[PDB]
Design a protein around this motif. Structure first.
Motif, mmCIF file in Angstrom:
data_model
loop_
_atom_site.group_PDB
_atom_site.id
_atom_site.type_symbol
_atom_site.label_atom_id
_atom_site.label_comp_id
_atom_site.label_asym_id
_atom_site.label_seq_id
_atom_site.Cartn_x
_atom_site.Cartn_y
_atom_site.Cartn_z
ATOM 1 N N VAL A 9 -13.346 0.414 11.436
ATOM 2 C CA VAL A 9 -13.614 1.142 10.193
ATOM 3 C C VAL A 9 -15.098 1.474 10.031
ATOM 4 C CG1 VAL A 9 -11.601 0.319 8.925
ATOM 5 C CG2 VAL A 9 -13.705 -1.030 8.913
ATOM 6 N N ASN A 36 -9.145 2.916 4.499
ATOM 7 C CA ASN A 36 -10.077 2.330 5.459
ATOM 8 C C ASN A 36 -11.063 1.380 4.806
ATOM 9 O OD1 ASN A 36 -9.632 5.488 6.433
ATOM 10 N ND2 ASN A 36 -9.405 3.977 8.083
ATOM 11 N N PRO A 82 -9.174 -8.205 10.413
ATOM 12 C CA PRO A 82 -9.165 -6.795 9.999
ATOM 13 C C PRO A 82 -7.833 -6.273 10.565
ATOM 14 C CG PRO A 82 -11.299 -7.386 10.895
ATOM 15 C CD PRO A 82 -10.353 -8.509 11.249
ATOM 16 N N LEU A 83 -7.155 -5.375 9.860
ATOM 17 C CA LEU A 83 -5.863 -4.886 10.340
ATOM 18 C C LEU A 83 -5.801 -4.435 11.804
ATOM 19 C CD1 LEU A 83 -2.882 -4.271 9.671
ATOM 20 C CD2 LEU A 83 -3.676 -2.064 8.779
ATOM 21 N N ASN A 84 -6.703 -3.547 12.220
ATOM 22 C CA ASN A 84 -6.681 -3.045 13.592
ATOM 23 C C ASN A 84 -6.600 -4.122 14.681
ATOM 24 O OD1 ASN A 84 -8.477 -1.207 16.014
ATOM 25 N ND2 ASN A 84 -6.540 -0.509 15.100
ATOM 26 N N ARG A 109 0.099 -7.509 3.850
ATOM 27 C CA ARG A 109 -0.950 -6.886 3.050
ATOM 28 C C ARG A 109 -0.405 -6.079 1.875
ATOM 29 N NH1 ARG A 109 -2.618 -8.019 7.759
ATOM 30 N NH2 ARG A 109 -4.819 -8.222 8.381
ATOM 31 N N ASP A 160 -1.423 3.947 13.462
ATOM 32 C CA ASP A 160 -2.770 3.697 12.953
ATOM 33 C C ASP A 160 -3.466 5.009 12.597
ATOM 34 O OD1 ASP A 160 -2.434 0.967 13.466
ATOM 35 O OD2 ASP A 160 -3.497 1.042 15.387
ATOM 36 N N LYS A 182 -10.384 -0.710 2.525
ATOM 37 C CA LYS A 182 -9.741 -1.989 2.233
ATOM 38 C C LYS A 182 -9.944 -2.982 3.370
ATOM 39 C CE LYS A 182 -5.004 -1.126 3.985
ATOM 40 N NZ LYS A 182 -4.805 -2.452 4.635
ATOM 41 N N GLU A 183 -10.379 -2.489 4.525
ATOM 42 C CA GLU A 183 -10.627 -3.342 5.687
ATOM 43 C C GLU A 183 -12.077 -3.821 5.691
ATOM 44 O OE1 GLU A 183 -8.141 -4.184 7.518
ATOM 45 O OE2 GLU A 183 -6.869 -2.758 6.437
ATOM 46 N N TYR A 185 -3.533 -1.663 -2.611
ATOM 47 C CA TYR A 185 -4.025 -0.392 -2.092
ATOM 48 C C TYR A 185 -3.116 0.829 -2.237
ATOM 49 C CZ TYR A 185 -1.385 -1.741 2.168
ATOM 50 O OH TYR A 185 -0.456 -2.140 3.104
ATOM 51 N N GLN A 203 2.026 -7.520 9.757
ATOM 52 C CA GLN A 203 0.706 -7.369 9.144
ATOM 53 C C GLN A 203 0.645 -6.423 7.946
ATOM 54 O OE1 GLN A 203 -1.660 -9.597 10.058
ATOM 55 N NE2 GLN A 203 0.128 -10.275 11.234
ATOM 56 N N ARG A 204 1.277 -5.256 8.049
ATOM 57 C CA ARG A 204 1.259 -4.309 6.939
ATOM 58 C C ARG A 204 2.086 -4.794 5.760
ATOM 59 N NH1 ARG A 204 0.844 -0.570 11.078
ATOM 60 N NH2 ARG A 204 -1.116 0.636 10.988
#
Lengths: 263, 262, 264, 264, 263, 261
Positions: B226, F217, E224-226, F152, F91, F219-220, D159, F148-149
């Motif tokens: 990011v 983005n 981190p998500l990625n 979150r 992604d 939020k990361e 979010y 993961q998603r």
């Protein structure tokens, strides 16, 4: 004064310094029993208000540690290996959260699990003729799974760490010094005394502050800068309320020697 | 052009603002100094003409020895907390400002003095400037103005830990070798060589320089995937800038670019 | 025996667990969108090829590895096209850190701007002692190293040092690059390809599954907090404890004989 | 009866450990840079007043808490000025989470745009059941919630929900705000101020040193990875274990008596 | 093997399920000794390949736990308290790294350190007559220092968690379910049974997948998500190589009942 | 209209619709994802598209996940790369300028929900069926971002409960836990979804776009720098034509003429 011996390890305590001496075997190759003792020593030292510094050294000639005992790993179920690795990692993780400053005194070969243990320490001093240092796990079809890949990347750089990890090559103490793998290189037959001198100088100073400084850096590095300074600020708050901080600001302002109490 | 405060003076000229520190013999500060410093940062932020800021001392042997130890003596612990928070937030502002901040080190740079320097984007020191480090531990406290954290990130956590717990200061040459400073100049030429560097920046595509400074200083705090997104938006602003159009042209036409900083 | 596949911007050679991506775009290897579309395809192709354990990226152009993006192509493009062009290039470079193969940038010529950015995205960088200039001069054009340059350079050599190089746009020598950690090796010019291939050969001939998982552990683990990073490392190790090479590797060591790696 | 200090666009009242910042900019409490300088100054003043344990932000304007930035002021500024304006406003809001006082936003009227952003920056939000509308309509102006709105809303209510609300620019009711976690309490319009004050008084009359460290632990610790966030929590706890109130609090409990809090 | 006991706790192992029964005090207020036993129970279960699920419950009426013993805490010196808290925290941190899914069966009051332990567990089931649940530490002049402020904030939201921590107010099981403080609310009398039923279903399924799913989510949430997805991918790679994946996969095609073996 | 083998892309009035017509239960394979990826790239380079709706042409399914037949055949190493590619494709949505809306009119389970999760919004019909991740019943996990998603989006504990049991839930329940953003009457799900998209496409689309990027983005990122990212996206907005047109229209109280730039 106050030395408790164990099977594969012995702990000496004196003048605010604790010395964990390793004596597992001829190459200090560890198994799950050794780490059980090592973990018990950290817990014991943590609960001991007197100890400000812990020096980890080896009593085995030519070797600090060569890593995990390969023979112990042979008749190991995969799931057992997992829990064995997990316990060793968690034990090493505890050092960064401990009030004492840990110093790895490297007088012999420090490779594989051996280097991983040293990487988990706050500092590393090595003799100019200690031998090899590195992670050769790759030559056995495995990787440095005791935090070695992660701690080395953070200590010397991810690219340089990757090079060392994939080729599994070891380097010299002098080379380890230049890439930041170790903090000091002392003449061989002068490594222990020079290490102890450093530790002694810490034990005789504002120890509450040295400990908090140690915590600030070691755990603050995992935080985003803007809040890491908040953590650093709370450790400072504790120091601003300590006796040594008062005694320290005074002695300085009175051109006199500070009488450190550790609190 | 010139604005003199009690403990500090600001000189603006040719896109470069210089903050001169003149607090006392060792430049040991109090809360009042930081309020002036904070005001200077804000004033410079709202001046679209300044592209670079150089922080320097008008005191012979010191850049800054840090916090006035006497001023903090017997100050309420709750006061110290707020004093430190204010000093930290003030220093935090540099990394968010559009100007590139350069610390010009000609004298000892220790404790709070180094902490202020660490919060700058770059550091240039004279070969006879003295010592640089964090001796706070000798007083029973630590580098609480971002010293432990910024030093760890700049030179490495283990090396920073060693310096902080022993409290021992090092030389400019040593500092250069470990990355604590970016340049070591001949003592007598330190100021001119710093201004020289600053001038080259101010005469270049300053919008790019600014966005580059932001991308790196704030991007380093983000996960890589990011952080490149952030870098990307800063790039989007440059692609739509006048200098970008001029830069791409001047390059294809093998000529000298006429930068406007817009 | 040795297979070779070619396109117009680059050629991929595969042999004994090693793939070489040769760049041949133009005088200075200044790229456009089509180049990256091909580079991306090569990455995907190599990923789905179990036999490739190492990838060497090199240039067939005399004095350049790559001078970055083609300014002619770059300009003349709408700001929104540039945004998407950059995004695609970045995502392409991002794929390397996630790939099983170890990516090595063989630098034999000028490596600047986008050229360095591509090299920064690789796992390792080896450069010739007469390779020329290396750096990020984008600022001289009024823009910045927008293909990961500002971010990866800062993480590799340090944020302040990277800031200095990026805002001035000045390039350095291979030697200087080596001292700040910008490259991992500096070889005698005429031996650069030779020694790079020799390094790759050693990797391809070892426990490549371990090599691969190690590369993944470090490149992706560096983005995580330490306490959980070691968990990621632990799962990669779990996979290794369950592989055949691990069994083989431990036996060969105790039985004191050269292990025969199978890559699985 | 509170100690009172009036500024041009706001007034600060102090009494019994509670400070109240009253907003009176104009008919819709639309702010400019001048207001935020006064708001920033108020925050600093309170920070240096060890007697203040809680801060309540409220409006003296009938139907509005705040409608956000003055669009007139915003339209005539240089984009570079807007950047610095937004940066200053953001940094001012960021200070709340680092302050020892618990900040409570008392919402009796419309809370939109920069108005909600200011509320989002506070630790808690109490709104009357007839307060009106709440949300971020910035998109309807071709801009976004640039004072932390997109980020704090996403973190507070999720979010995806935050994205939906931001891209459409639609406001919701206090009851809807309560259910998604946008506000912590919905009180009868008529007694919204008294109940907010009542909550504040309970805090101010309790172990305030613990309340403060708790607020700091959560607001800054939420930005840290869990394993080290607890280390931060631990140092804040260490400060309490050494406090006078901790000794007294533990004793009072054992002696089944009312604690005599000192806030130290 | 058997259902071994200890002083303040007893562990019962059977059919892939281990139950940690707490019986410390009439309110289950703990001290350092208790956590030592809890840590030992966690380690023993880790090294037991047959345990898939761990249920933590209380044998003491009206209380799951009331937190740390105020007498033990009050009289202790600051430095000891610090180490005591650190140890309890590291013990709880271990749950999230363990292969077993941890379920907290709440039948009595779950407050202060009591809730903090429940928070460290993967799931929480509570009886509709279990009583109170919350963090009243502030009423004592201290805070939920054993992960309380942090896990609560992450679980139910930072602002809501903040409100609950600073007022020290406790809530009902129903209200807890509404804010997500607990996963289920069973009829008081049917609590232990319904909790065991859920635990039974888990232990009788693709247990390797369940374990890795738990590890993926509990540790991946810190990344981190990625890269969190990379972590998820390696755990998946292990599943793709397990016998159960091959079983359940083919069994699915053969419209047949899968025979899980946990590997 | 641009037609492909496993899917179809319809473009009009600033909205792009990706219709899934793979098979019986829209259970995908690698080829499908190669087409989805290509669609994303194409839409990205189309400055006219502001919103993207993903919907199914299959009656009772949005998507049931990865085709189990196509999967079993694969070697472990192929599966890794297969998953890696799918993940990277999903992604790309969070980085694209368009706002992605998953239109759920049928079952959305496993890889099907994982795809929906990568989208910015999810609207589902009250009689759309089930939604969740039943991968566990196969001896594997939601390996394409699912674990993961979901964690979150709905919370780590709630997601853990759903992932380990493989239990699926109703649309109403999904709405309650925040799994979806809306639940519309079945018969008018597409209609109401298109209305939402339409209102988006007709507004200040540059703002809508930068808002979507700021949130997804940012939020990361740690809050203190996440707001910096938000700030640069705002700097781009303050320099757009619409920002000037938007600020004017408000003070002149006249409906603004958006241009999307």
């Amino acid at each position: 004064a106050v030395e408790t011996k164990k099977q594969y390890l012995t702990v000496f305590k004196e003048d605010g310094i604790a010395e964990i001496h390793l004596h597992i075997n001829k190459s200090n190759s560890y198994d799950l029993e050794f780490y059980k003792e090592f973990n018990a020593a950290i817990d014991d030292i943590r609960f001991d208000p007197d100890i400000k510094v812990v020096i980890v050294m080896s009593d085995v000639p030519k070797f600090f540690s060569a890593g995990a005992d390969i023979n112990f790993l042979r008749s190991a179920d995969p799931r057992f290996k997992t829990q064995f690795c997990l316990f060793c990692n968690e034990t090493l993780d505890k050092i960064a959260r401990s009030p004492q400053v840990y110093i790895a005194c490297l007088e012999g070969h420090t490779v594989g699990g051996g280097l991983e243990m040293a990487l988990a320490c706050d500092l590393r001093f090595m003799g100019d003729e200690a031998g090899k240092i590195g992670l050769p796990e790759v030559s056995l079809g495995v990787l440095a799974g005791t935090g070695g890949t992660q701690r080395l990347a953070r200590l010397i750089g991810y690219s340089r760490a990757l090079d060392m990890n994939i080729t599994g090559e070891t380097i010299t103490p002098q080379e380890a010094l230049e890439i930041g793998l170790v903090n000091r290189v002392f003449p061989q037959a002068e490594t222990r005394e020079r290490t102890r001198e450093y530790a002694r100088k810490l034990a005789n100073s504002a120890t509450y502050a040295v400990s908090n400084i140690k915590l600030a850096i070691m755990n603050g590095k995992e935080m985003p800068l803007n809040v890491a300074i908040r953590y650093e600020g709370e450790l400072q708050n504790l120091l601003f309320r300590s006796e040594d901080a008062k005694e320290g600001l005074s002695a300085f302002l009175e051109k006199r020697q500070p009488n450190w109490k550790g609190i």
